[PDB]
Amino acid sequence: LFFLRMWFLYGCCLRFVLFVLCYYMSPRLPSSGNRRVLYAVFYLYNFVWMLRCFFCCFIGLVMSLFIIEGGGFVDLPGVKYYTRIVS
Amino acid sequence: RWAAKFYGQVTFGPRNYPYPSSRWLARRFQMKKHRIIKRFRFRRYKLAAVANLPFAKMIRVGMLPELKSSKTKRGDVVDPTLSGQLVSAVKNTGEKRKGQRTRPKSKYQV
Amino acid sequence: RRREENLYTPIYDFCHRIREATEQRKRFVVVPSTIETRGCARVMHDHGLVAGFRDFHNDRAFAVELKYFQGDSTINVIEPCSYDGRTEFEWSPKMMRRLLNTHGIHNRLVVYICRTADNRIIDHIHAVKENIGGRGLMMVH
Amino acid sequence: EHPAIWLWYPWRMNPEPPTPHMPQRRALKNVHGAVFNDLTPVQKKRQEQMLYGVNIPETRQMKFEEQHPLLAGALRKLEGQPKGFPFWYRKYPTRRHAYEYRFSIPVEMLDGYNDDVKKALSKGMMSIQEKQFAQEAMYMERYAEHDFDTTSPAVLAVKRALKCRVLRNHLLTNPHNNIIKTVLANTERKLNHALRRLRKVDFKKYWEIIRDHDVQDILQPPNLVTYRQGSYWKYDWNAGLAISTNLADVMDPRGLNGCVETGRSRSEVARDLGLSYTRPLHENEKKQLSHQAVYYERLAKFKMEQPEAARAMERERFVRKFSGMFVKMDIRSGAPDFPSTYRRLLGTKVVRWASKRHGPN
Amino acid sequence: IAHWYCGHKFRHRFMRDKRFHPSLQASHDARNRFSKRRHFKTNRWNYQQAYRDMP
Amino acid sequence: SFKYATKLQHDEMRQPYYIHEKRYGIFSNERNIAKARRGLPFITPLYTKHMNLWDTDTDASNNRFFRGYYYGQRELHQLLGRPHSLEATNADGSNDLSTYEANTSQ
Amino acid sequence: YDLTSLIFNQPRQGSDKIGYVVGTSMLKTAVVATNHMVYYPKFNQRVSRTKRFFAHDEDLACVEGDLVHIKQCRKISKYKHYYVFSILEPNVEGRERLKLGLKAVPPPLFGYPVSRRIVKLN
Amino acid sequence: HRSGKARAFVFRDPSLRMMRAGSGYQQLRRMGMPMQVGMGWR
Amino acid sequence: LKTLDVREYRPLAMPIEFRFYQRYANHPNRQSGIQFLTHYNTHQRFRVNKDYIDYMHWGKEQGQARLPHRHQRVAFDFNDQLHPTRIGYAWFASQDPTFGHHPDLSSSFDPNYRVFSHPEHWNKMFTKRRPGEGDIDLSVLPSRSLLGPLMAHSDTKGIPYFKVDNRGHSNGRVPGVNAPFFGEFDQKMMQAMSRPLNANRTITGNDGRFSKTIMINEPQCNQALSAKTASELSKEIDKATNAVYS
RNA sequence: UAUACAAUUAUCAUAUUAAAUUGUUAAGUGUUGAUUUAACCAAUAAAAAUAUAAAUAAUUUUUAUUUGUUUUUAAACACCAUUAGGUAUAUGCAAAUAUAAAAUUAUAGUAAUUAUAAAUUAUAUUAAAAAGGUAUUGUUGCCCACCAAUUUUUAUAAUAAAAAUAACGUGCAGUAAUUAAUAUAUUUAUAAAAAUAUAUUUUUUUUUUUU
RNA sequence: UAAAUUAUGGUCAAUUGUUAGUAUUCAUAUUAAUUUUUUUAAAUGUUUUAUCAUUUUAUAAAGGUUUAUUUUUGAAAGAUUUUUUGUAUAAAAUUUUAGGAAUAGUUAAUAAUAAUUUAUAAUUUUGAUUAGAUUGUUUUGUUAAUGCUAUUAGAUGGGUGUGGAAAAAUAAAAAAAA
Ligand SMILES: [Mg+2]
């Protein structure tokens, strides 16, 4: 188990975040493609943290806040958090 | 010695490996050590430890406003008397006085 | 030789002498002579784990004669109870009674040696008999 | 000019030497870190007295004559004549006992030989090592409990004292052999052991050894930390000499013990038996006590002769008792350590104290 | 070993446990266990004449 | 030896209450229960330790915790001046009597 | 269970202590270093720790380096709950050392450790 | 693996594992060693 | 460093030293192993600072160069002889007249005997190892020079004639060495470790699997049995004889 | 998210029972000139040899002491630079592999691991016979640093550090690999790295029991 | 330095992951939890009394404390016709931070002293004081097991000092003088 990947869950299983950016990043070879990465924000003890996580979710009509869960590893190095649903 | 012999763990091989380090690993870490040392030389690092001061905390003299290499970065704040004395030390270290013991010289020491 | 190292005991290296001399198939071992050490020898010789033993009233050492059967030793394993002298394990009578019991069947196969408040060196079987607790020394079988 | 400066170019393994430069020759420490520049005049005297020569004390001739008057009678008949039978053998019980000539050759054995031979076995002809062994044997003999005693504390302490002086002046001459620095330090440690066992065996001999060879510097407790925890005094516990005193010759034991049933201390039963044990006092304790003894006479004189001043002070005290922090004694007020038992007040509410601990506890 | 105590690695836990180990405790022989090196070579150039009030 | 014996909430796993009486006298706690500051957090300490383990009364002969060598008894023998060792003849730490104990009838 | 409870029957834990006298700078006050015991059940072994106490000796017998018996008592001053019950071993060497006008024990050579480098020459 | 945990050559005799546990914390709680200075369970 | 492997390299070799490091040591200066059966102050042979061994010139007669020399061994084999008892034949007069020198009585046997080891005694490390070089202590090998016997040669006869020494054999009267020897030789140790079958240690015994040895021990009165000792023997004899496995 | 190292043998930086320290010797002129080197250039050339015994074992030196950096060239070799020189080897300072440790990296938050050794690889003068692989249908094999973008953590040193990374441009550092490599030391620098001083084989071996 | 029997006694220790050359407690298992669900809580007006008063009705606000928290019967219980006693405030142990330095209305003696009594004072490297985190010494989970891993909550200075005891300014679920 790798315990430092969970740094921004802060001892919680799931997180609530707000959408900011959505950009694309290329995974580690030999896997080619475009991985969609959402750049999100949330606040804890009046500090505003920018969270960076893998967008696997389904976007419908335009919506703002997501639910973040931690997984195993993914093709893309450096992105620990995954998306459950969008609200 | 003050400085570090190694950087990172240079002896990592399997147990009972009958040498301190393998060739491969030692070459990797020789690379990293090389880069760090080269950085020290070109940026012209200088450290000092003064008597009757906390020793673990070393005044970095290479960042002092007079001896600073960069024209841009704000260097450091060290006492006026002490800093004068440090400048004098660095300056009068440079050249060999006869009767004194010969000590290794370099471009980057100035 | 230094601080982190274990503090050895005549029992510790008594057991390891015997173990190593059993691995090299020797007939005789010269071994440290203290009260509980030659106690341990008399108990092992009772159970027949050892061919014989003698104390010559030599101060340092005395001698043990090992027994082999069917080409390997009579001793599977022999282990000291404590690694240090700074650690002392006490055996409750119920514990020594647990050892004797293999899921409902009475098992005397393995022997455990221990000190008593009475300075006797006993196996766990006599200990359980008279219901006295004792300090652990070593196991052997 | 002002503190030394080490300059370190971090690509280099070690710093450049300091600017004031230090002394060119390293100081020689004793075991505890104290510095000796040279032998002390006493030790110097010991080596100057070893060098030119030693001597057997006529003490030995005397006790030889009183113990074995017959043998001494024989030697007394035979002086100057060559002897084929060594009557003198009782005078020299051990090989080591005869140091006045080389190779442990007793004096009276040289009677019938050439004077050249006599000069060739003389003290002047000894090597330096032989001379050391000579001094050591003489002193060992003066402190020994019997002839063959070696391991006893006094003997050990003396021989180690001598060895130590030798090594010290040796290091004075040729500065770097760190083998012998180490051997000097180890010797000094074993000397420390020997002396601290001595003062609990017989202390006067301990004293006169320290006064003869001038080693008080290795009896000094190393540092305040381990001393404050009483591990300096803890040594003679480990050595097993802690209870060894055998009081009755000194210190009549009647007032050293407390009463179990009464609960009264030793100062109390001493009070009752009309005995006084008190350590000799320095001027501190004397002038403190002599200042305190007189409080009531000074007071009586004050309140007789000068009532108004007194009544002023009293006004202030009496009225003070009503002002102030606490007017009545409760567990809170009567807490002997206020900052300690309430630490939770110290930053915020209570500003008087800046720390929670002013004493052991 | 709970992962929140001490460092993020495991071995940091056992490195701080060696601070509490029974046979490792500080005494008159083993001293300054936690910083040995700040106090090293501290008195080298401090010259102290040892204390003798007896000849 | 199991988990059920870990739970002291059974009265069968727990040293009984009355011991604290036997040490401090009977009905001694009824006093303590009426105390001003109680149970927040602390109550007047309740001493229950199996009476064969009591440090006060018992000694090296009936109590196994006293005859532990390397800290209690080692110091004691060093102090009293008995010869001692790791594995010794006497139950406690000691090969033989000291000089005082041999020369004096107590 | 340690030396102290081995020798004494204590009405209350810590009511008796045996220790050494370390320093007397305070009138009618003897500081005493004492050992007590800690048990680590994980490793099944004991450690000795040490602690200082202020003890009250009226009449000022105690010389530094005495082996003393010490008891719990009435609160005396802010930090003194203990009094010197009996001198087990007096310091004969120290007393004779005082009689000659010298300090009981030589003062420790170095004080507490520092993080500086003191350059003090001659 | 110079950098990593020490492994036993064989297992440990379970019986010995149980014999060394005699003075452990649970047995102590059962003997009553620790003082009860607080309310504890309700 | 680069956090991944740039090279895909799988060696298939599994050297037994790499895997089980509990039982094998590849570090130089640790090669002498774990031997408990030595007489030294450590069970780890390679921390011992006394006798440094010589891997090149040693171990002709003992097998490996690690193992203890023939004369220092504290553990003995079944079919191998154990140490000779030193003397320092007159005392066999009661025995077989032809019986020669007993194999276990030796004139010169030294349990403390320094064997010459090069790395200790001849140490070439501080030199270039040219033919004469290296530092040598001569205190090990007995001097084969003629200087000694010449320099000390005297008209007074030697120590033995002068009978300077006190004591004698350290055990006092010994049947083999000092006094005469009567009865029978036990060459195997069979009578020397036996268990007293009696409270009086009068009768002793040695039991094999299927065999039983009862030995009467009363060397003082010439094996004359008392009433108690005889009534005892009639017990040990029939309790040995009515045993199941004898 | 909690949920059981070893204690018989484990290679990088926390030493510890030890006998050393000190020695004033050698070498130098006849004469007309191609020595050394794979090749250049400066330009007198000969040389510095001796010590064993003895020192007792353990228990409170850890702020103490200690691990190849050293005055004098009017003395050389050697090394570094180049016809104009520098330097030329333990009196200052300098703890430090000989192992007490808990998966790799990383200043202790970065990536998800890393490291490793015996299979396989055609030419070394026997009356043809001994050999290495970071590759893995294997040299047209792999890999190494600087040089752009970006991503991310922070203890911001010419131009911060570290980690992900798949461009462009230099080369050719490494796999006994085109002057063998590895570690420490000191110097040098487009970049791998290179020169020298010590140790050393995870480099391949060449072998006089008085001639 | 001998064996043992008047025979199973003194009441149960028992370990379950389909891996990927090898070295090292580390992904995917079970149990326990958070994810996860309205079958146990609850509303305001306390109450007498001799009248502007006087009797009864004593530890859930916050702050962040690791050498730390300690106490009586004079209230009630409580029984006689009246003067009734003594015992108490003190201590000992256990005390956290990867890379570590000084702390301070300050110690001890005097005494119902001293904002300037006397003294060679006290705490600290056997780890202090500040500073971070944190509600302290019968409570849990896992486990065959010395372990590892939890345990809430409740005592936050004085300033007409009432009261037996400060625990005294919403937040019960304590029958509070028919
Ligand atoms: Mg976490």
Ligand SMILES: [Mg+2]
């Ligand atoms: Mg993947």
Ligand SMILES: [Mg+2]
């Ligand atoms: Mg380099």
Ligand SMILES: [Mg+2]
């Ligand atoms: Mg207090």
Ligand SMILES: [Mg+2]
């Ligand atoms: Mg605060």
Ligand SMILES: [Mg+2]
């Ligand atoms: Mg448990």
Ligand SMILES: [Mg+2]
């Ligand atoms: Mg790999």
Ligand SMILES: [Mg+2]
């Ligand atoms: Mg290969």
Ligand SMILES: [Mg+2]
């Ligand atoms: Mg280390």
Ligand SMILES: [Mg+2]
């Ligand atoms: Mg020079």
Ligand SMILES: [Mg+2]
């Ligand atoms: Mg960044």
Ligand SMILES: [Mg+2]
């Ligand atoms: Mg960067």
Ligand SMILES: [Mg+2]
């Ligand atoms: Mg290349």
Ligand SMILES: [Mg+2]
């Ligand atoms: Mg190269």
Ligand SMILES: [Mg+2]
């Ligand atoms: Mg190459």
Ligand SMILES: [Mg+2]
């Ligand atoms: Mg290299």
Ligand SMILES: [Mg+2]
């Ligand atoms: Mg380059």
